[PDB]
């Protein structure tokens, strides 16, 4: 009901397709930079040289507190990659706790398909664990430094707010995109209860999905398939990504449920937009999707349910017309499930590192209609859940 973390509430900007970022400063004197919040990696890095898609960048020669680790680093992601130089420097977060810490920083010197034209961010904050950090787990991630060096609780929470309609660059810059509450939980960001799922292993923020429903109908697959490889929560991935086999069955089911309207394969492949006359998007013909996650109590699970208002990503019309257009934001994966931005926009997500668990609650800013809402409900009796984890 209350919350109580006002200095951090509304400190994010951006959208699902270009990422959500937070303002940070690095160096002495402070150099202001926009940093993408990414729970799918563990390296804090920043553009350290001119780039066509960068308005500004980190200038080590201008920071009196900069320290050179004399070591290069290479970081590849599902899509995009970069190369940089390791060092450390003082870091702060204007709309975050009032502390300054010395953290590791990769000064990006070369990159490919990493930076995005007009996203307005110039660096990335890898919020996951050391295990996946490059070059290796000896490079302490930013959040580990923060906790070790201050009294900020070992926990952060994220409320990513999708608009439900497209935003030009002027709008994205002028609008609040959400909240990243460092060291706490703000009750003003959600409704209902918070349900927690265990973090399987501390590397990516890994979880276990035990069941999947499309409009209440069991996708009915061997639950290991749902985590075939792994299942992670990643704010830096736009789409809800599913293992190929799961994806194929899910799309078959979503197609059957929305069959009152036919759409081209390019749409289901997430390649082309679909448009409807202003205000007539037929939300009701699309099904809700429910992901069941392992609970903290034995044989207990809970589910999170999203609407098409979450999985249909708003995009401006090819002709910038007055139609309401979207792309299908669910796609296949050969590297496990990725609960990306479009899924996170439906919920307030608590990354409780201290208790090795992740919490979900209906977001106070999720998009919906007058007939349906996102939901987080439980408990459900589920047996042999760990069996769902892939080894």
């Amino acid at each position: 009901r209350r919350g109580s973390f006002v200095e951090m509430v509304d400190n994010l900007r951006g959208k699902s397709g270009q990422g959500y970022y937070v303002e940070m400063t690095v160096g002495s004197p402070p150099q202001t930079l926009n940093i993408l919040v990414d729970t799918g990696s563990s390296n804090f890095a920043v553009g350290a040289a001119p780039h066509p898609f960068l308005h500004r960048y980190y200038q080590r020669q201008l920071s009196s507190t900069y320290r050179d680790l004399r070591k290069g680093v290479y970081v590849p992601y599902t899509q995009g990659k970069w190369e940089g130089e390791l060092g450390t420097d003082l870091v702060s977060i204007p709309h975050g706790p009032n502390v300054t810490v010395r953290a590791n920083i990769a000064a990006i010197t070369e990159s490919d398909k990493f930076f995005i034209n007009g996203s307005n961010w110039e660096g990335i904050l890898g919020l996951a664990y050391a295990e996946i950090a490059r070059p290796d787990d000896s490079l302490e991630p930013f959040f580990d430094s923060l906790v070790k060096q201050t009294h900020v609780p070992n926990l952060f929470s994220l409320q990513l707010c999708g608009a439900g309609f497209p935003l030009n660059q002027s709008e994205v810059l002028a609008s609040v995109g959400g909240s990243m509450i460092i060291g706490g939980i703000d009750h003003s960001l959600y409704t209902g209860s918070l349900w927690y799922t265990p973090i399987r292993r501390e590397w990516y923020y890994e979880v276990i999905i035990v069941r999947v429903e499309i409009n209440g109908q069991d996708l009915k697959m061997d639950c290991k398939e749902y985590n075939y490889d792994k299942s992670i929560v990643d704010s830096g991935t736009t789409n809800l990504r599913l293992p190929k086999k799961v994806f194929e069955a899910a799309v078959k089911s979503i197609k059957a449920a929305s069959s009152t309207e036919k759409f081209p394969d390019g749409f289901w492949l997430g390649e082309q937009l679909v448009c409807w006359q202003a205000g007539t998007t037929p939300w009701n013909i699309f099904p809700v999707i429910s992901l069941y996650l392992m609970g903290e109590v034995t044989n207990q699970s809970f589910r999170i349910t999203i609407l098409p208002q979450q999985y249909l990503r708003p995009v401006e019309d090819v002709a910038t017309s007055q139609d309401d257009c979207y792309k299908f934001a669910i796609s296949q994966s050969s590297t496990g499930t990725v609960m990306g931005a479009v899924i996170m926009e439906g919920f307030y997500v608590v990354f409780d590192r201290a208790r090795k668990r992740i919490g979900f609650a209906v977001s106070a800013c999720h998009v919906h209609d007058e007939f349906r809402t996102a939901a987080v409900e439980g408990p459900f009796v589920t047996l042999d859940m760990e069996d769902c984890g892939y080894n």
């Binding site: 699902s16 270009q18 919040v37 990414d38 599902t78 990335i124 991935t237 990306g340």
Partner: peptide
């Protein structure tokens, strides 16, 4: 359009 690390 974002797909942020490989292990």
């Amino acid at each position: 359009e974002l797909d942020x690390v490989e292990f």
